[PDB]
């Protein structure tokens, strides 16, 4: 498993200096994901004397 | 006046910065003082009026 930041929006603008507060912006997201693993297997069978 | 009136003094003027409300631009200062007064017996003394 892992994580990967998608994006993150702006969080402030020019705030009309004659003013004494601030503002809020839109943050992003983290989007934790994961991944599995696959396998492969095989068999066979022979003779004994034919291998001689 | 050493017995006609009286002035009681408790705390002089004081001044301090009001942390909170001050958002790094609107620095808000707060101050004040406390004292008072009263009269003795208002007989030792008169007032000339028209």
Q: Which residue has the tokens 């603008």?
A: A13
* Backbone Cα Rg of chain A: 30
Q: What is the three-class DSSP state of B9?
A: strand
Q: What are phi and psi of B15, to 5 degrees?
A: -145, 140
* Distance from C-alpha of B23 to C-alpha of A10, rounded to nearest angstrom: 21
Cα B31 to Cα A49, B24, B27, B28, distances in angstroms = 109, 19, 13, 10
Interface contacts A/B by beta carbons within 8 Å:
5
Residue A20's nearest CA partner among B24, B18, B30 is B24
Q: Cα distance from A26 to chain B (closest Cα, Å)? A: 22
CB atoms within 10 A of CB A20: 13
- Residues 6 or more apart whose CB falls under 8 angstroms from that of A23 comprise A12, A13, A15
**Sign (positive or negative) of CA dihedral B10, B12, B15, B21:** positive
CB atoms within 10 A of CB B5: 13
* Distance from C-alpha of B22 to C-alpha of A34, rounded to nearest angstrom: 46
Residue B44's nearest CA partner among B16, B15, B3 is B3
| CB within 8 Å: B25 and A20 | yes
**Resolution of this structure in Å:** 4.0
B25 at interface of A, judged by CB pairs closer than 8 A: yes
Find out whether B7 and B32 touch, Cβ atoms under 8 Å. no
């Amino acid at each position: 498993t892992y994580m990967k930041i998608a994006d993150y929006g702006q969080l402030g603008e020019y705030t009309c200096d004659a003013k004494c507060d601030a503002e809020f912006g839109e943050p992003g997201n983290i989007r934790h994901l994961e991944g599995k693993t696959y396998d492969y297997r095989g068999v066979f069978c022979f003779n004994r004397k034919n291998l001689q | 006046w050493k017995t006609a009136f009286y002035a009681v003094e408790k705390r002089p003027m004081f001044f301090e910065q009001y942390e909170g409300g001050s958002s790094a631009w609107c620095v808000k200062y707060q101050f004040g003082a406390e004292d008072g007064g009263f009269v003795g017996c208002c007989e030792h003394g008169r007032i000339l009026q028209i």
